[PDB]
């Protein structure tokens, strides 16, 4: 089971992003996948943890009500719903599980221009 | 502010849909939106409400863990995520608010052909 992370790019503040977190090798129907991101120099940190079938989906502080994790099980696929998009949400954004690498990652730039 | 549903369709069980509420003549950041469905010559139920800034979203008994609501500001549009979709979520889909009407809705068919 691998994931691949995609649909970072450029942003305003204000804006709105939604990454995608393709599955390979096995389904990810039943199994929480996390959200994490990093910024270079800096720690990275969680964002988002998706449901299960016992559990609801989380949300780290400084996301909560700004950000949404969704599935498409048909395209074995996790998302991450991105609005109200500030500068400090410029990082490179991972998915992962216990049990995948951290991933390439995708980038994220939230900008003045 | 008014709201129009769309993205129904026909799934097999098992199945993924994501459907739309595309809002007009305001903006929803701001604002609880609810999904709602209905099949004909049954009650009229309540499915989801979206997140504001001080509530997170709240699923139905039915579709907890199957469902997810979402939004992307940026297209002023509130989305219904479905998933592992069942032959009883068959019905006709509705969002609004208090402000708005229920709409013309939007047709999804759970069905095995």
């Known amino acids: 089971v691998q994931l691949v992370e995609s649909g970072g790019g450029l942003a305003q503040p204000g804006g709105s992003l939604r990454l995608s977190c393709a599955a390979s090798?096995?389904?990810?129907?039943?199994?929480?996948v996390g959200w994490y991101r990093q910024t270079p120099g800096n720690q990275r940190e969680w964002v988002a943890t998706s449901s299960t079938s016992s559990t609801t989906a989380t949300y780290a502080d400084s996301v909560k009500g700004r950000f949404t994790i969704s599935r498409d099980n048909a395209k074995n696929t996790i998302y991450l719903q991105m609005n109200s998009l500030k500068p400090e949400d410029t990082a490179v954004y991972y998915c992962?599980?216990?049990?995948?690498?951290w991933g390439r990652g995708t980038q994220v730039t939230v900008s003045s221009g | 502010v008014q709201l129009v549903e769309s993205g129904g369709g026909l799934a097999q069980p098992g199945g993924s849909l994501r459907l739309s509420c595309?809002?007009?003549?305001?903006?929803?950041?701001?604002?609880?939106?609810?999904?709602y469905r209905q099949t004909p010559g049954n009650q009229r139920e309540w499915v989801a409400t979206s997140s504001t800034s001080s509530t997170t979203a709240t699923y139905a008994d039915s579709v907890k863990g199957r469902f997810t609501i979402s939004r992307d500001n940026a297209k002023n549009t509130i989305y219904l995520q479905m998933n592992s979709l069942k032959p009883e979520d068959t019905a006709v889909?509705?969002?609004?608010?208090?402000?708005?009407?229920?709409?013309?809705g939007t047709q999804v068919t759970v069905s095995s052909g």
């Open positions: 992962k599980t216990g049990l995948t690498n």
């Open positions: 090798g096995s389904t990810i129907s039943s199994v929480a």
